Amino acid sequence: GSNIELHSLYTSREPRVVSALQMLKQHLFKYQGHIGAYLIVAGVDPTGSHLFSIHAHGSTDVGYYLSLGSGSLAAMAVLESHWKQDLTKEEAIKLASDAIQAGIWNDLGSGSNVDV
């Protein structure tokens, strides 16, 4: 986030998700998984809207719907059941918070409130 801010100032351009994605994966790969960060990286930039997942070992993937953490299987079950192409904003928030709820209820690792 710090290095992306300095890059944005240097280039006089709003930062891109692919930049954050590249910088994260090269850092996590360097440390061979010893930095146990499992991140879902999303955002909008001049290129458009982007959604990526990045694992601790430094592997990245692209998707329309992603889930990570202990509740990923509870969340993915809901996403695999209810996701469709050309979702509206209201539908996507509903589907997202429904997938977290699945995790909260059915996973001992997940609990409390939903942040969107």
């Binding site: 990570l68 953490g69 202990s70 509740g71 690792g109 997940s110």
Partner: peptide
């Protein structure tokens, strides 16, 4: 350490 703490660990979703």
């Amino acid at each position: 350490x703490a660990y979703x």
